[PDB]
Write a protein that binds this ligand. Structure first.
Ligand SMILES: *C(=S)NCCOc1ccccc1
Ligand SMILES: *C(=S)NCCOc1ccccc1
Ligand SMILES: *C(=S)NCCOc1ccccc1
Ligand SMILES: *C(=S)NCCOc1ccccc1
Ligand SMILES: *C(=S)NCCOc1ccccc1
Ligand SMILES: *C(=S)NCCOc1ccccc1
Lengths: 305, 305
């Protein structure tokens, strides 16, 4: 029993973290086979700092301008190239600790673990969801750029996120590992801001099922609702629409607890309209939306890597 | 910016996790140098199951009754002994991945990471506090016994917890790595139950400081209180007393934010008496008590391992 925000074990990713330095700028890189991936802003100078041309900045660089350290070992850079907003530093040694890996781009509402790192050294690990507005609510201090987000499936690490910056509301933005930003964000100085966000309805339902599996039942009721009457209430409370595909994805949890998805939707409608009246669900006084249906199933069934 | 419940990177502990089997009972062990540590209940039979004598059960065992697997490699058991409620299985191979480590016993109100494991394989990592009643609120399914809790300081792993069982309220109990239970719990069948618990006041204050460091200030006020008037209110709301030593420990956070500890105590008194009036602090509608002052400082300053 119990339900916790749980990250993936981080070892396979720890063995890939290196430090990348250009001039006085130091950040983290991801060392896989003989390539080190890092945010391209590591090549920024003090000359523009506003709208600089990265292609110009990179033409002016040489391999020996990039200092890459893996623990105490300096790695020799033997090529460099740009990949959208990430840099690819070819080094002369393949990382002997390279796991099985894939680069995947995730969807809003999906979750992943973040290994927060400073100076190539891991400091902590936690779970993030990609918000509907393509930001993440992380914990990142100066120096943490280049930290990555990932999921692990058996022995395969799917890298989905590299950290690039903090927006003015204190939330975080970054790219997939092909260097393409999540959301309408750029690695140049602008007044860019997080757009309006919404609550991930299918995840809130998944978390109510987790609560039932763990013995919290007080919010259950004898009612069922239709998908459209539910979605009318959802819209009113800034929740995303619930699709039939979401209902299908919740199938396994509905089956394990014998509570129909539309039946649970009636419970969510009541919680949205009336609040919790001083009660809590899985130790929270708010409705939690950062657990996917798969996150619930994996934690209630016991899958390992 | 941002504040997240963050676990330690788990790699150093992943490389110590093995599977221990006796008969049909399989659980996890911790392989350090040439010793595997695991809960002694792995030797339980179906014969008593109530109040069995572990010393008798262990005399009846032979080394070859213990099957220890490290990944795909079987480890040869060459001695066995009892250490309070843990078993020490001497094996013929030292673990080449043994980190620098210490066995430390922690205090109620201190936090640690848990690497949840099944069949010797890590499945997830999360942060726990040791509650005042010596339970922890974890996420553990059948098979997870022998999972460990730890902190990491530079390159040193301090192991503080091994998981033994779930109590009837769904919270978890276990031992230090010398095999001594936290709290008044036993590894035999009884009606034992978690005693009454209280909220860890110094941690709630630490978390209010974290909130201020991250820009949540709405609960601040111009008042200060005395330590005794604060502790009168604390007692009334089932909070632990705040000592002068707690005030001293909060010194660094008080200094960074320029808000005196007694000044912050006035804020906590108001929150306890009036609630949050629909607001949140660091994304919570409840007062959070599972972050120590050190946890806040480490996450706001950026220490790594
Ligand atoms: C190099 S100086 N680029 C100009 C601004 O750089 C950044 C903008 C936003 C995030 C990170 C770097
Ligand atoms: C990640 S280490 N972020 C710290 C500051 O980001 C910038 C890096 C380079 C130019 C501008 C901003
Ligand atoms: C999961 S990430 N699988 C993708 C690549 O799988 C392998 C990689 C290297 C060796 C064998 C399989
Ligand atoms: C062996 S059968 N011991 C009797 C009861 O065993 C346990 C009691 C509580 C937790 C774990 C094992
Ligand atoms: C940890 S794997 N717990 C599962 C059940 O615990 C027991 C083990 C042996 C005897 C009694 C209970
Ligand atoms: C931190 S856990 N230190 C305790 C033991 O330190 C060492 C262990 C092994 C080799 C060197 C130092």
């Amino acid at each position: 029993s119990g339900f916790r925000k749980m990250a993936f074990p981080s070892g396979k990713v720890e063995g890939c973290m290196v430090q990348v330095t250009c001039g006085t700028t130091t950040l983290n890189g991801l060392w896989l086979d003989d390539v080190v991936y890092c945010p391209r802003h590591v090549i920024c100078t003090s000359e523009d700092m506003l709208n600089p041309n990265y292609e110009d900045l990179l033409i002016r660089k040489s391999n020996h301008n990039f200092l890459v350290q893996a623990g105490n070992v300096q790695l020799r850079v033997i090529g460099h190239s740009m990949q959208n907003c990430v840099l690819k530093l070819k080094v002369d040694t393949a990382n002997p600790k390279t796991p099985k890996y894939k680069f995947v781009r995730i969807q809003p509402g999906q979750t992943f673990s973040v290994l927060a790192c400073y100076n190539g050294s891991p400091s902590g690990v936690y779970q993030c969801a990609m918000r509907p507005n393509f930001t993440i609510k992380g914990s990142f201090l100066n120096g943490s750029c280049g930290s990555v987000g990932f999921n692990i499936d058996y022995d395969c690490v799917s890298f989905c996120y590299m950290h690039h910056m903090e927006l003015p509301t204190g939330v975080h933005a970054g790219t997939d590992l092909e260097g393409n930003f999540y959301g309408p964000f750029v690695d140049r100085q602008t007044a860019q801001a997080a757009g309006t966000d919404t609550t991930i309805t299918v995840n809130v339902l998944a978390w109510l099922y987790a609560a039932v599996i763990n013995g919290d039942r007080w919010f259950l009721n004898r009612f069922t609702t239709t998908l459209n009457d539910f979605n009318l209430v959802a819209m009113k409370y800034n929740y995303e629409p619930l699709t039939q595909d979401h209902v299908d994805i919740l199938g396994p949890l509905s089956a394990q607890t014998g509570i129909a998805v539309l039946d649970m939707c009636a419970s969510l409608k009541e919680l949205l309209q009336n609040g919790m009246n001083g009660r809590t669900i899985l130790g929270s006084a708010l409705l939690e939306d950062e657990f996917t249906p798969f996150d619930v199933v994996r934690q209630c069934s016991g899958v390992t890597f």
